[PDB]
Amino acid sequence: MDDVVKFIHEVGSLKLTPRSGWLKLGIRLPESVAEHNFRAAIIAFILALKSGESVEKACKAATAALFHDLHEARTMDLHKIARRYVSCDEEGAREEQLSWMESKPDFSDVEVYVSDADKLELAFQGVEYSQQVSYAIRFAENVELKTDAAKEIYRVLMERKNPVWWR
Amino acid sequence: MDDVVKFIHEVGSLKLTPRSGWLKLGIRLPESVAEHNFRAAIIAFILALKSGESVEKACKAATAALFHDLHEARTMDLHKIARRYVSCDEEGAREEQLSWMESKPDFSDVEVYVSDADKLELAFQGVEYSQQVSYAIRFAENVELKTDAAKEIYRVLMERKNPVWWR
Amino acid sequence: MDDVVKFIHEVGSLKLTPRSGWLKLGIRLPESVAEHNFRAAIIAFILALKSGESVEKACKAATAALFHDLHEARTMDLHKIARRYVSCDEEGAREEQLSWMESKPDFSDVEVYVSDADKLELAFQGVEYSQQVSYAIRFAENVELKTDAAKEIYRVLMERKNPVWWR
């Protein structure tokens, strides 16, 4: 049970890992990787449901999104610029990180919802941050989504560009 | 002059790049890479002087320490854990980053002072953060220094473990 | 060596001293004095080289820039408004602060590069912060630089007013 406890402590380090791409824009206390995964997971649930999949399938897409950048607990969030000079053995990181699992789950079937959710979460955060730093909107521009549900949500997000959800 | 102005803007991103090893210890607003380089440069100046080198040489070691992690503006501060799964083309990054320079300086002759200053700065910051988080003292333990001047400063640093400089 | 160790601890307090002029603009976690000196040192190096001076000369200008506000570790960054009512014994502060030095190096020959670098660093930081708070741009306006190299860099900084160095 010790491996599981260390793994839960390790997962907590994602609350302490900044989503790095925002730092160069001058955003001082940007969202953490944990916060990106949280919302991306909820978006993935939505994409699956809106795509006609079952609740069970929608819950699997959400879970897969939570495990999506897990290895970054060890490798950090390598932003676009960095990836030009930095190569990471993600498979290795994930391997060792998930050593406590007898077997690892089959998420190949919801990978599309995870991928779209990851990019859509970024677009939403880009529109929200654009209110502080105009240039943040570029992270939401020319996003390549694969599913029709993601494309429709993205279209309305950019149509509105209005993060005020209250009132 | 446009390349120079972009480079100066790029250098400023180091004020927005956290020294990442501290984040997993729960230190929320840790020193930036720029802050690490600032003090390491002053320490490198001191190491050279105390090592019997000339003021001119001491100023070169300080300058070399300022340029030491410059490429991290693009590659990020890859901490110990990350270095296990992450490989970086530092030379590549540095080259592209310093393209504006007609010819880049040597610094091979003060490399030892820069190397020791980097480690000593970390040890001082470890002792300082240990007052917040006990485990930070680990970054100041078992430090492998090369110069006798660095070894003596380190010895007193650890003998005293007292960051209170105001009396 | 105890005086040297305390001095190094003291220098680290500059990572904890805010550049105060920004606080009244509502910028919450502004650059530290350490971060200002870091980039000003790199700029001073650039100014010397572009002014035809030698690398050794450029390295001395950078070092002198690092020691420029050192006394602020004890006196704080007295901003413009404050200086109307606040008088500080800077030489006294520096004197006592550098008592550990057998002798103090003379940076009289590079004081002009240090002076221009200090102001240029502020102008760059003003342009960068203007993306968050419009008024920040005033810190980059009507800047009186002395060297032709600083004037040329400043002219391009203000022609571009574009802190995006990554593309």
Side-chain angles (χ1 to χ4, degrees), chain A residues 1-166, chain B residues 1-166, chain C residues 1-166:
Chain A
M1 198 88 283
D2 283 294
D3 293 335
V4 168
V5 166
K6 276 183 106 73
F7 171 77
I8 291 166
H9 280 312
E10 178 174 354
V11 165
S13 77
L14 290 171
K15 301 191 179 172
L16 305 171
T17 299
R19 281 269 290 175
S20 68
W22 307 117
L23 300 163
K24 67 183 178 305
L25 272 57
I27 297 158
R28 288 294 256 162
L29 293 174
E31 43 148 8
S32 63
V33 173
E35 290 167 337
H36 162 63
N37 297 153
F38 167 75
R39 191 157 60 168
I42 291 176
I43 292 173
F45 177 79
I46 292 169
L47 293 184
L49 287 192
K50 286 280 151 166
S51 285
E53 308 258 358
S54 63
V55 178
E56 305 66 20
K57 191 63 62 183
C59 292
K60 185 165 175 190
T63 306
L66 294 172
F67 282 87
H68 195 221
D69 313 322
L70 273 203
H71 63 279
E72 292 184 344
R74 297 172 183 217
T75 78
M76 303 173 67
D77 175 11
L78 304 175
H79 59 252
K80 187 163 89 98
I81 296 176
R83 255 134 46 208
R84 173 184 178 68
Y85 317 88
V86 180
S87 65
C88 158
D89 169 31
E90 177 180 320
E91 200 165 282
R94 178 177 173 297
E95 208 64 69
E96 315 199 322
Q97 179 180 64
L98 296 175
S99 66
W100 62 276
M101 293 186 91
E102 326 76 340
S103 61
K104 300 182 289 191
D106 164 27
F107 296 144
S108 53
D109 60 320
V110 287
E111 175 178 55
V112 71
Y113 299 118
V114 181
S115 183
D116 272 2
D118 169 42
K119 294 173 196 168
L120 206 46
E121 202 289 316
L122 173 61
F124 268 82
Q125 189 56 76
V127 169
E128 292 151 2
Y129 283 156
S130 77
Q131 314 300 300
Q132 284 167 52
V133 178
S134 299
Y135 192 83
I137 198 71
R138 295 305 187 314
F139 287 89
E141 296 182 328
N142 302 114
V143 172
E144 308 291 11
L145 298 165
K146 293 180 289 193
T147 73
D148 281 357
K151 286 174 182 172
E152 186 54 30
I153 290 181
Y154 178 62
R155 178 175 183 190
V156 174
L157 164 75
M158 299 305 278
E159 203 143 49
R160 295 182 69 259
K161 289 190 190 78
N162 177 20
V164 183
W165 52 266
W166 62 90
Chain B
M1 211 59 57
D2 278 287
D3 283 19
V4 172
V5 166
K6 271 186 174 302
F7 172 74
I8 291 164
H9 279 310
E10 176 174 352
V11 165
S13 74
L14 291 171
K15 310 185 177 178
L16 310 164
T17 297
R19 280 273 285 174
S20 66
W22 308 117
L23 299 164
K24 66 187 179 303
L25 277 59
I27 298 163
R28 292 289 258 162
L29 292 176
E31 44 145 9
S32 62
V33 174
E35 288 168 334
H36 164 62
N37 297 153
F38 168 74
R39 188 158 62 169
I42 290 175
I43 289 170
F45 179 78
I46 294 173
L47 292 183
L49 251 35
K50 287 276 160 174
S51 286
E53 304 255 21
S54 66
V55 176
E56 293 66 21
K57 259 298 296 293
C59 292
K60 185 168 182 185
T63 306
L66 292 172
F67 282 84
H68 194 220
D69 310 321
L70 274 201
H71 63 281
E72 295 192 340
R74 299 172 185 218
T75 76
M76 302 174 66
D77 175 9
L78 305 177
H79 58 254
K80 184 193 188 74
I81 301 172
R83 252 124 54 192
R84 163 162 203 173
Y85 319 87
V86 177
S87 75
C88 163
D89 175 17
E90 181 188 313
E91 205 171 300
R94 176 180 177 297
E95 174 191 47
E96 312 207 319
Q97 185 182 64
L98 294 176
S99 59
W100 62 274
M101 291 189 89
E102 290 96 309
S103 59
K104 40 203 174 187
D106 44 63
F107 299 151
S108 264
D109 59 320
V110 289
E111 209 167 15
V112 69
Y113 296 119
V114 180
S115 176
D116 271 4
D118 172 37
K119 295 183 213 156
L120 204 46
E121 200 289 317
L122 171 68
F124 264 83
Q125 188 59 74
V127 168
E128 293 155 358
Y129 284 154
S130 77
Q131 317 300 300
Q132 275 170 58
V133 180
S134 291
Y135 194 83
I137 197 67
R138 258 43 174 156
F139 293 86
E141 296 177 331
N142 313 312
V143 180
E144 306 296 24
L145 297 165
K146 294 175 293 194
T147 75
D148 285 346
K151 286 176 186 179
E152 192 44 46
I153 287 174
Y154 178 63
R155 182 175 184 196
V156 174
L157 168 70
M158 303 302 278
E159 158 172 35
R160 287 164 23 82
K161 290 194 187 76
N162 178 19
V164 181
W165 52 265
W166 57 96
Chain C
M1 211 60 63
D2 285 83
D3 279 34
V4 170
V5 165
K6 268 178 168 39
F7 172 74
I8 291 164
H9 278 312
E10 174 172 355
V11 165
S13 77
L14 289 173
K15 310 185 175 177
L16 307 168
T17 300
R19 280 273 285 176
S20 65
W22 309 116
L23 300 165
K24 67 186 177 302
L25 275 58
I27 295 158
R28 290 289 259 164
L29 291 167
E31 43 142 11
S32 63
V33 173
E35 290 166 334
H36 164 60
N37 296 151
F38 168 74
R39 186 161 61 169
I42 293 173
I43 291 172
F45 179 79
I46 289 168
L47 290 179
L49 287 188
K50 287 280 157 175
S51 290
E53 305 247 19
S54 70
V55 176
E56 313 69 50
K57 209 69 56 63
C59 291
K60 182 171 188 185
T63 306
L66 292 170
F67 284 87
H68 195 211
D69 310 316
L70 228 51
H71 61 92
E72 293 184 348
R74 296 167 187 226
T75 74
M76 303 177 67
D77 174 8
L78 302 175
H79 58 249
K80 327 66 204 173
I81 302 177
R83 290 197 303 282
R84 288 168 176 173
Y85 316 92
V86 183
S87 71
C88 161
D89 169 30
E90 181 181 316
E91 191 47 275
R94 171 134 88 191
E95 209 64 72
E96 320 199 324
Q97 187 180 54
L98 297 174
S99 64
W100 63 273
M101 296 188 86
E102 9 49 59
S103 58
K104 296 154 179 42
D106 244 82
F107 302 126
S108 272
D109 56 325
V110 292
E111 285 321 291
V112 174
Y113 296 116
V114 179
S115 187
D116 271 4
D118 174 29
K119 298 181 207 159
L120 257 192
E121 201 289 317
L122 173 66
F124 268 80
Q125 187 58 76
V127 167
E128 290 152 3
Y129 283 156
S130 75
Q131 320 300 126
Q132 280 166 58
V133 178
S134 292
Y135 192 80
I137 198 71
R138 292 309 195 306
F139 289 87
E141 293 176 338
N142 316 308
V143 173
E144 309 295 30
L145 296 166
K146 304 173 203 159
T147 74
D148 286 348
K151 285 173 184 172
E152 182 165 29
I153 287 176
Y154 177 66
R155 179 177 184 189
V156 175
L157 199 224
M158 303 302 276
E159 288 184 303
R160 299 181 63 258
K161 287 196 189 72
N162 174 27
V164 183
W165 53 266
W166 59 91

